[PDB]
Amino acid sequence: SKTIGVIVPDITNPFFAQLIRGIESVLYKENFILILCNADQDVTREHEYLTELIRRSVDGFVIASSEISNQTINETLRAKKIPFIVLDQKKAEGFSDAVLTDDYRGGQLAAKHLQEQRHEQVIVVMPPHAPVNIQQRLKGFCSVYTEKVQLIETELSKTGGYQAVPEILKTESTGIFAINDEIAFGLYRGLAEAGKKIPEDYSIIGYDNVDMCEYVSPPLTTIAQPVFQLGQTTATLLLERIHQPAKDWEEQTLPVQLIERFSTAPLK
Amino acid sequence: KTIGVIVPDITNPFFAQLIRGIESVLYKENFILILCNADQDVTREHEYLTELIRRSVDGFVIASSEISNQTINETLRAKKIPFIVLDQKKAEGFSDAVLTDDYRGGQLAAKHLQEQRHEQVIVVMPPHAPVNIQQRLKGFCSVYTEKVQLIETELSKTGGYQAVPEILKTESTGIFAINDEIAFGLYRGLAEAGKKIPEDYSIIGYDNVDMCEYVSPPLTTIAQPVFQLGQTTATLLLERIHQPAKDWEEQTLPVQLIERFSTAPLK
Ligand SMILES: OC[C@H]1O[C@H](O)[C@H](O)[C@@H]1O
Numbered sequence: 001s002k003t004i005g006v007i008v009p010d011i012t013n014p015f016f017a018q019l020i021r022g023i024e025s026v027l028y029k030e031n032f033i034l035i036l037c038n039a040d041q042d043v044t045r046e047h048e049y050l051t052e053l054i055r056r057s058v059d060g061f062v063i064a065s066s067e068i069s070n071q072t073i074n075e076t077l078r079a080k081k082i083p084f085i086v087l088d089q090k091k092a093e094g095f096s097d098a099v100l101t102d103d104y105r106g107g108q109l110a111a112k113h114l115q116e117q118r119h120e121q122v123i124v125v126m127p128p129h130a131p132v133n134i135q136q137r138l139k140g141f142c143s144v145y146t147e148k149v150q151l152i153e154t155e156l157s158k159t160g161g162y163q164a165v166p167e168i169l170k171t172e173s174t175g176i177f178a179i180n181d182e183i184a185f186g187l188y189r190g191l192a193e194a195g196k197k198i199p200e201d202y203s204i205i206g207y208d209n210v211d212m213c214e215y216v217s218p219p220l221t222t223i224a225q226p227v228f229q230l231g232q233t234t235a236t237l238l239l240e241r242i243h244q245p246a247k248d249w250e251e252q253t254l255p256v257q258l259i260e261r262f263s264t265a266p267l268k
Numbered sequence: 269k270t271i272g273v274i275v276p277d278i279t280n281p282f283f284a285q286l287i288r289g290i291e292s293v294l295y296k297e298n299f300i301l302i303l304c305n306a307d308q309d310v311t312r313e314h315e316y317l318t319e320l321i322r323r324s325v326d327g328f329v330i331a332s333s334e335i336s337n338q339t340i341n342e343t344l345r346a347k348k349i350p351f352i353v354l355d356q357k358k359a360e361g362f363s364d365a366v367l368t369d370d371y372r373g374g375q376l377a378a379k380h381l382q383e384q385r386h387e388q389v390i391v392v393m394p395p396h397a398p399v400n401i402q403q404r405l406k407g408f409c410s411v412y413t414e415k416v417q418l419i420e421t422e423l424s425k426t427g428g429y430q431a432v433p434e435i436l437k438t439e440s441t442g443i444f445a446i447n448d449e450i451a452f453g454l455y456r457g458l459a460e461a462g463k464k465i466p467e468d469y470s471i472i473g474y475d476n477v478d479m480c481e482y483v484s485p486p487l488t489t490i491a492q493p494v495f496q497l498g499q500t501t502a503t504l505l506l507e508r509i510h511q512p513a514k515d516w517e518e519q520t521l522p523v524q525l526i527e528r529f530s531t532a533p534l535k
């Protein structure tokens with residue numbers, strides 16, 4: 001059949017849309033078709049569609065969502081010898097292929113940047129019970145930042161960043177690390193409604209470098225993930241297992257970098 | 269149970285939300301959704317689209333003009349695989365189709381700029397546009413019957429950005445961006461040139477994607493009911509599946525103006 005199942009958290013976040021293009025770009029060349037499963041549109045309580053999809057007889061699965069459990073994977077895919085690869089919000093056990101990006105180092109770079117701009121009181125805005133990759137950004141951030149950090153939990157979404165703004169306005173913080181660019185966009189909107197300026201009132205740094213970063217005002221300083229390349233590499237490694245099932249388990253980490261734009265400024 | 273869905277590209281939030289609408293129906297009925305981003309088949313012969321359209325599925329959703337009627341007739345009709353067309357794929361009589369009112373949308377954008385007192389306006393849009401998009405221009409020009417300039421550019425954020433130098437050379441005051449992505453491009457470019465919205469240019473977009481609420485100023489635009497377009501499309505297809513003799517059904521959905529803060533009366 002030459003079918004690959006792709007399970008992502010959503011397709012509305014430009015991050016996961018570009019992941020899919022990355023994958024599609026590799027699959028097209030080999031006449032594989034992409035079965036799309038974004039978990040957000042499975043509205044059942046116990047992910048009935050996901051559990052039924054993971055049991056289809058496809059040639060391989062890309063798993064980027066933590067909603068597929070290690071137990072499920074063992075009883076369906078390892079038991080049936082259906083190759084798969086994990087990334088992003090799906091944590092690797094270590095007996096599979098996986099492609100990570102360097103979340104820990106990204107958090108370090110974000111911290112280093114706010115320190116270079118002399119911010120001493122900062123907020124990190126992130127979801128509760130965060131996926132491990134996301135948690136690593138906070139961990140990397142706190143590995144090098146030794147001044148006052150406050151955590152605000154909010155939904156991993158534009159509405160989430162928006163709904164965090166009232167709490168931020170009650171604090172003494174001057175710099176904000178938004179754990180993804182969508183949160184940062186939410187911040188922008190909420191801060192604008194409050195008549196607060198960026199970066200004059202708040203310095204903000206995002207994460208991902210989605211295309212919209214250059215179209216918001218001011219352009220958003222962020223940590224770039226190589227998402228197109230993550231999608232290409234992920235598909236490439238999966239098709240390699242499909243063609244030689246017994247190859248060794250491979251786990252690569254792709255690098256990240258700071259993209260400085262106009263959304264931070266030195267504390268004056 | 270499989271449905272092939274052919275869209276121009278999923279990186280446009282419009283198409284992401286369409287797919288979400290489709291999925292709200294398909295997932296509950298346990299269908300598999302095969303995605304094809306038509307944009308990414310850059311082969312001379314569109315060999316991937318041919319490969320895909322020849323697959324044995326239960327049905328196709330076709331929102332791309334890159335699948336010709338000939339290809340459909342010879343492949344889908346001849347094999348009795350049901351399908352439905354929408355958006356950039358023009359409907360004929362002998363197929364199901366869900367439209368949105370592109371002509372009226374264009375008229376609504378024009379009426380808004382007219383109410384906002386703009387006399388010299390520009391429309392920013394792609395060359396050889398899909399028919400549904402072309403209709404927006406037709407609608408808009410039904411109202412602005414003179415003093416409309418057309419700037420042709422790619423249907424994307426970078427396209428809108430690229431168009432700003434040409435805009436700056438005109439005396440226009442109001443701009444209709446044929447989609448929100450082009451409008452976001454205009455924002456970036458006009459910021460770079462030191463121009464303000466709406467103080468120097470009033471801008472109206474098209475689609476009402478999520479991001480309209482998060483740009484500065486929030487973008488006035490023509491909303492397409494895109495989730496519901498997704499739902500209705502998937503419903504009509506499954507209806508044809510369980511009743512293949514069904515008369516063809518061709519249902520145009522409504523649009524409307526969402527007024528935010530990217531236009532102002534010309535002073
Ligand atoms: O922006 C979406 C986030 O959730 C995912 O885990 C990605 O890494 C990305 O940062």
Ligand SMILES: OC[C@H]1O[C@H](O)[C@H](O)[C@@H]1O
Binds near residue numbers: 280282355401447449
């Ligand atoms: O926004 C992408 C555009 O191309 C498509 O034709 C849609 O209708 C939308 O307006």
